[PDB]
Design a protein around this ligand. Structure first.
Ligand code: JM9
Ligand code: JL3
Ligand code: HEC
Ligand code: HEC
Ligand code: HEC
Ligand code: HEC
Ligand code: HEC
Ligand code: HQO
Lengths: 37, 449, 72, 218
């Protein structure tokens, strides 16, 4: 069956917001724990 | 018998379960007040013991050079093994399609969470440098150091963290429509938001119920091998060693069986006062006590089989260290633990075959207390006696526990009972849904004849 | 709060002649048990005795000592 | 709708998002604090009772580093100099001066000059200056340009990982063993071929041997 938010125009903006937050936090943690010294 | 007594409706189930929480604090029972006062006094004992341990050292205990693991590790395995039966009722009985989980799983999973909370401090408490528990965790540091990951204590880090996290997650998932029921049944407008933000607007939707049932099924089918792997890893933190009492390969299913044994002992020992002090005779029944004692008898028989396996290994081996392990257990300075273990785990389970003893309530209470004492004695026999006498006879000494590890044990009992009394105050002891669903299923069974 | 305290250092006012700072230095002394002395090579780390060894040139030493000379 | 208002859904989603961001920010703040230059005392001019000027005494006066740190090529401990070594020249230059008043106050009594240890290793680490100097590691690669320092600062934190970086890849930092005391030496454009050549020439051990625990700790 379809999900609850299927057909909502905010779904792909909020997915890009969550993935952008995840990749920014991942790159920032990588910078602090590998390239900071 | 039956797992649900006749004469119950959905609104009666909802009222009779959710009216023990949501009462005003001025109407709190004096029995709860006395039990919480005892629990808070022993929690003060916990705070005093932990403070003196952190001030002075782990040398306030009885541990020494041959016996480096003592009552701290005995109580660790005991408290972490209490939670296995609650995880079994929450997950394995959901997998097996057993209808008696619906009235014991909330309290049993809460007991699992509080027992894991008591047993997760014990690594940090016994650690000797307690503030460096995070060096066992794989974390990024400026040294470039790693945990070894070949030791079983790194597996214990991962297993205890995963067990606590997934148990808390599954308990909260099982609480979310109970949170909705409490949010609906509350009276004050400010305690509506206490359960409203924890229910997240559940609505009881049939589209939401499909995803909920699928998530509960997959969480049960992930938490069954989770709990077996956690208790296997807690077996492995002796079984990967070369110690003659510990290099025994039946330890992972033996520790699984011992944990389920002690867990249902504690579960029965805490259902019976809850059943006789709250109006839950219709929900927690004599059939529930009978089948819980049946699982106690089965798992205690598996632990007796594990004792026979260890005795067979000692007699079958030509190894002098296995032979002296058996001799030391039978006629050593700590043979009281082995003999009391044999009485409390072999003699005391032969009454549980009998139907009248299985149905009897004070016999069940006495048997559960005896099994808890004998399981503490089992963990004493596994750890302390095997560490006392080792390969080199020059490195032999006796482990004598002090007053401080006993005080820490009494204090973790108080922490467990404090968390349990807080749980039975602010949360329902039994699941409001899945018991009205159990009532609907029994109504459908009666309609199907 | 910092990683460490200040950790002051204290050099000499006049450097010793035959001493290199950081190199432990061995001196041939004699330790007596019941009046009978035995030759010992006692190690001076920074001008102070820290470890007693044996003197291989010495008759009652031969490089090895006893527990009393070790605990001197 | 019965209890919570219209914006409660957005408020709850933003609360979950802000809680995750707050956990990440707390972990980040803890990591930055434990790696910070203030915590590790890096790039801060640590004040001395005399305010001795390495920049003057090397780039201007021209004193060799072994004149004052006499034990750096022979023992683990680079020598903190004596008041005798200071007064060897300062019996005539700039006498009766209030900034050399502490040095003149010493050498008359036995009281030393209590310098502050800028490069302080935590006493389970056991650095050896002699083998590092004799195996072609210059002072500038590990202490910085101390020849231009008026007040000595820590150029880097003495991390275990920073030590193991050169113990695992020494060819990026090895130098002809005759360019160790030269503060004007810079590594060449390529430096990798000659680093491997110097590692093979000086017999520098593999990273397994150099990353053994009892190399440093004890
Ligand atoms: C020596 C190492 C051994 C490795 C052990 C691996 C066991 C892990 C199994 C997890 C349970 C998932 C079953 C879900 C489910 O409930 O299945 C439903 C059907 O519904 C579905 O469509 C499935 C839902 C999603 C399943 C995806 C699972 C994700 C992958 C797991 C990640 C693990 C890693 C390693 C890949 C009905 O089926 C069942 O309910 C059957 C459940 C059987 C329980 C098994 C009990 C065995 C206990 C022994 C444990 C052994 C120790 C070593 C862990
Ligand atoms: C405890 C550690 C190990 C756990 C492993 C247990 C297996 C869990 C996953 C298997 C699921 C099995 C499929 C579901 C099922 O058939 O069981 C439910 C079943 C039928 O119930 P109805 O739907 O018909 O309704 C009845 C009530 N309304 O109920 C059962 O009969 C339970 C089946 C017994 C399982 C036997 C497993 C024993 C494990 C032995 C391990 C070996 C030990 C060696 C030392
Ligand atoms: C990088 C591998 C280094 C080189 C090359 C040299 N030094 Fe060093 N120095 C280094 C460390 C890690 C430390 C701390 C040691 C400790 O136990 O705290 C030091 C310390 C000094 C000191 C203080 C006194 C001492 O600990 O010996 C001095 C005076 C010093 N270093 C000077 C010095 C000079 C002049 C060097 C080039 C010949 C030199 N060091 C080499 C790191 C390194
Ligand atoms: C002879 C080679 C010297 C040794 C060894 C040390 N110092 Fe020196 N110092 C020397 C000169 C030629 C100068 C500059 C004189 C000028 O006119 O510019 C200095 C300078 C100082 C100063 C500054 C004094 C001032 O500017 O008035 C100080 C405080 C100082 N030196 C201290 C000092 C110490 C403590 C030394 C022992 C480690 C030391 N100097 C060595 C000559 C020499
Ligand atoms: C005598 C005139 C010196 C010469 C030549 C050099 N240094 Fe020195 N060094 C000297 C003193 C009196 C001190 C302690 C006071 C201070 O300012 O730190 C030092 C200390 C260092 C240090 C700091 C080590 C520490 O205390 O943690 C370093 C890194 C150091 N010296 C390096 C160094 C180098 C590379 C030099 C040659 C260019 C050098 N010093 C010359 C005295 C003298
Ligand atoms: C690169 C600039 C280095 C840094 C940073 C550190 N060390 Fe080092 N170390 C380096 C070399 C080229 C060698 C030579 C050894 C060889 O076989 O070539 C060493 C060796 C040591 C030793 C000697 C021990 C042994 O060789 O068995 C010690 C005690 C040592 N290093 C200590 C040490 C410490 C504690 C460091 C962190 C402050 C450190 N070194 C950093 C090069 C480099
Ligand atoms: C010399 C090249 C080292 C080797 C090999 C190892 N360590 Fe190390 N250790 C070294 C330094 C310079 C430091 C200080 C780090 C700092 O930030 O100041 C350390 C420190 C540690 C620590 C931290 C101690 C503490 O914070 O209390 C640990 C836990 C440690 N070292 C462990 C460790 C182990 C187990 C090693 C062998 C695999 C090891 N280090 C190698 C220098 C060196
Ligand atoms: C963050 C979770 C870490 C808590 C668990 C630590 C693991 C851990 C650490 C230990 O030192 C042990 C010593 C004896 C027995 C078990 C042990 N466990 O499990």
């Amino acid at each position: 069956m379809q999900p609850e938010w299927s057909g909502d125009p905010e779904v792909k903006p909020v997915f890009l917001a969550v993935t952008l937050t995840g990749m920014v936090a991942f790159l920032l943690m990588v910078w602090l724990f590998a390239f900071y010294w | 018998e039956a797992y649900l007594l006749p004469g119950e409706t959905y609104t009666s189930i909802s009222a009779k379960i959710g009216d023990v929480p949501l009462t005003p604090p001025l109407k709190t029972p004096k029995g709860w007040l006395a039990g919480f006062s005892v629990a808070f006094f022993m929690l003060m004992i916990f705070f005093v013991s932990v403070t003196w341990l952190f001030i002075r050292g782990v040398g306030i205990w009885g541990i020494n050079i041959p016996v480096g693991w003592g009552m701290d590790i005995i109580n660790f395995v005991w408290w972490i093994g209490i939670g296995h039966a609650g995880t079994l009722i929450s997950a394995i009985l959901l997998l097996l399609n057993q209808g008696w989980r619906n009235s014991i799983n909330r309290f049993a999973e809460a007991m699992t969470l509080f027992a894991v909370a008591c047993a997760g401090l014990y690594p940090i408490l016994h650690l000797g440098r307690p503030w460096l528990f995070y060096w066992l965790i794989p974390y990024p540091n400026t040294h470039g150091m790693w945990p070894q990951f070949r030791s079983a204590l790194a597996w214990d880090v991962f297993a205890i963290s995963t067990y606590a996290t997934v148990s808390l997650v599954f308990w909260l998932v099982g609480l979310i429509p109970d949170f909705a029921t409490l949010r609906d049944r509350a009276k004050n407008i400010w305690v509506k938001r206490l359960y409203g933000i924890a229910a997240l607007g559940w609505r009881g939707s049939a589209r939401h119920w499909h995803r909920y049932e699928m998530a509960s099924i997959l969480l049960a089918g992930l938490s069954t091998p989770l709990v077996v792997s956690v208790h296997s890893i807690i077996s492995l933190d002796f079984a990967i060693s070369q110690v003659p009492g510990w290099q025994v390969t039946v330890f992972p299913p033996y520790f699984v069986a011992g944990a389920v044994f002690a867990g249902f002992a504690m579960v029965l020992l805490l259902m019976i006062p809850v059943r006789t002090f709250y109006g839950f005779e219709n929900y927690i029944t004599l059939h529930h006590l009978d089948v819980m004692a049946k699982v106690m008898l089965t798992t205690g028989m598996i632990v007796v089989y594990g004792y026979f396996m260890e005795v067979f290994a000692s007699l079958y081996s030509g190894n002098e260290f296995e032979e002296y392990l058996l001799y030391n257990r039978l006629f050593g300075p700590s043979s009281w633990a082995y003999w009391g273990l044999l009485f409390c785990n072999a003699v005391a389970i032969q009454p549980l075959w009998f139907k009248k003893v299985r149905q009897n309530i004070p016999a069940l209470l006495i048997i559960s207390l005896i099994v808890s004492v004998g399981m503490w004695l089992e963990r004493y026999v596994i750890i302390v006696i095997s560490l006392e006498r080792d390969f080199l006879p020059s490195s032999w000494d006796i482990y004598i526990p002090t007053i401080w590890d006993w005080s820490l044990y009494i204090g973790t009992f108080g922490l467990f009972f404090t968390l349990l009394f807080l749980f039975i105050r602010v949360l329902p002891m039994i699941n409001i849904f899945e018991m009205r669903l159990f009532l609907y299923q029994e109504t459908e069974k009666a309609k199907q004849r | 709060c910092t990683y460490q305290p200040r950790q002051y250092i204290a050099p000499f006012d006049r450097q010793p002649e035959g001493r290199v700072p950081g190199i432990p230095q061995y001196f041939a002394s004699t330790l007596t048990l019941g009046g009978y002395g035995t030759g010992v090579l006692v190690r001076s780390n920074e001008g102070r005795p820290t470890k007693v060894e044996g003197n291989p040139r010495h008759p009652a030493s031969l490089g090895g000592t006893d527990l009393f000379a070790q605990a001197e | 709708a019965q209890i919570f208002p219209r914006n409660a859904n957005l408020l709850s989603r933003l609360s979950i998002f802000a809680l995750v961001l707050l956990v990440v920010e707390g972990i980040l703040i803890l990591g930055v604090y434990f790696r910070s230059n203030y915590f590790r005392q890096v790039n801060v001019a640590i004040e001395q009772p005399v305010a001795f000027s390495h920049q003057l005494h090397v780039n201007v006066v021209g004193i060799d580093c072994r004149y004052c740190h006499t034990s750096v090529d022979q023992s683990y401990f680079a020598n903190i100099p004596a008041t005798e070594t200071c007064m060897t020249c300062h019996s005539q230059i700039k006498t009766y001066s209030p900034l050399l008043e502490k040095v003149r106050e010493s050498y008359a009594t036995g009281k030393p000059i209590e310098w502050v240890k800028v490069y302080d290793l935590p006493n389970f680490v056991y650095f050896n200056h002699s083998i590092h100097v004799n195996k072609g590691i210059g002072c500038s690669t590990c202490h910085g340009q101390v020849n231009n320092m008026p007040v000595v600062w820590q150029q880097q934190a003495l991390y275990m990982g920073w030590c193991l970086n050169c113990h695992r890849n020494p060819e990026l930092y090895v130098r002809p063993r005759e360019e160790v005391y030269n503060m004007d030496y810079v590594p060449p454009s390529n430096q990798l071929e000659i680093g491997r050549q110097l590692v093979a020439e000086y017999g520098i051990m593999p990273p397994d041997q150099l990353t053994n625990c009892y190399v440093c700790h004890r």
